Amino acid sequence: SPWFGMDIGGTLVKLSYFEPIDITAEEEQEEVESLKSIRKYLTSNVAYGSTGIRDVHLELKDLTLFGRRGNLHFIRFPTQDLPTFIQMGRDTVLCATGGGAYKFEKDFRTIGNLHLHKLDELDCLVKGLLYIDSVSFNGQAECYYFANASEPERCQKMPFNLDDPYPLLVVNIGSGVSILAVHSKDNYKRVTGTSLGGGTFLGLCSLLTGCESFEEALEMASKGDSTQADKLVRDIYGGDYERFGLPGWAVASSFGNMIYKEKRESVSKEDLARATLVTITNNIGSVARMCAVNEKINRVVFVGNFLRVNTLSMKLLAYALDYWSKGQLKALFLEHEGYFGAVGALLGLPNF
Template structure:
């Protein structure tokens, strides 16, 4: 069977999918399935890995298990269990491979399911260092199928905010008949997909300004080292000290074009003034960077949804700022 030009029929069929990986340009996302249905006795190696993963919420300095994303009572490969989600920087891939070798992952199976560009980039390393083959899946196919799988088991995953101009309230969204809709896939960069059915979709546009841009600029501007540091700084910052707003130009609203006084007129526009630069904090710079990136992505998505007559737009973050940060 050919999938996007790759003859996956020549690859060995993947074993029970205890693990799956999305190896992106900035982050590696690993999902681990923990069976709970009393199936066949598990190998000692698997039990040891399960104990290690569940005992910790952090692995080394950069690996994180997102406990709040855990999904219980799901079905994978005919088994019932729990999905755990772990992430670490792609730059730490060598450390992950060392850990995988030390824990004996290759004794569980000969292959691991993987998607993303890194499934191609690091394939030889997995084979040489760990003895694992990668059963590769197209990342956009995986994305669309994953959206519908997650939504079928956790309806709270698809939501919107009511009263966005006032006090935002998180509301569940009815995803029973979503077509057509746009997926705004925010990773290191951004791809926007038009989805017409579970199997019919195409990429309609994108932008290079994404999560990787946010983290890269924050590292340059604030001296932070990790995504968590960048988000923590942004949560405490005030972007209006960095950005030039409509009120800074007009002294208030610009009613002719329905522009409120607090609308950003120029991202980082205040930074051409020495006095304002000197009064700006690291937190302000991080928040302004986040606002700049998200405003740009939102504008592109809005323009594309209008031109394609899409009533629904589904942002999908492959990097995970806290809800409080996005809500500000």
């Protein structure tokens, strides 16, 4: 039986797979042809079907897991295509997490004698996060931040040490947002969440701009000017609102300039894409800061696939957190930001 870990979310399925590379000549003969055909299929291809992708750059190599040396692979595909995934498998213990582990439980059991063990999506998130940072990213730091995030000529990616990670505020930006307070490896809680997450960005951008992919929405946003749609403090006061420390460039009302018909007719789709990104990202950063001040935690780490290949939101979260906290809070990011639930599920295999 292959060693899998699966996080079936509302939007994407994340899969962690451990490829053994210490296979002996005796183990290779005892390897069932269906087991060997799966390993060759997953290691010989980087695209699976029309929608499966292996993030090769994130692969952890020569990892010692469960007493075996092997490579840890990271694979993703849309939850919409899970029926295809299950149908291929109908032609083994699966530790599955996320909402889809419960919603599609009966569908997984159509696979003969498959044992499905459901694990909680936030248990696996914490366990997977702490594990990846503990084994490092092939010798490099798993955690990083943007140094001098307020100065763009100095803003640069720098490693960050999490050798004692407690306390920690984890902001999981998926379809929605979950915010966790991690006080210990066995003591964490979900402080709150918001429904304004990555699905809101992709959903609104599809309605406003007709974009057909997450990557295309980011590409439109990078070319836009969000101030064409948002109403700023300087649009209301003529400048800064100095009494309450609000700079003139601060957004007073997201999409607030779209109450005027003349501005709706001159705004571009790139502007609306950028305004959607800024609106979602700013709100997430503000909620994270409020929870951090309440939980008395100064280290806030952002995970989830909304930040995948999304440097604009990361730098915006970095600048916003630092500016509005007066330097008291730090925005942290992880190289395997979308796969920690799938890793945590895989780590539950010995417990079964």
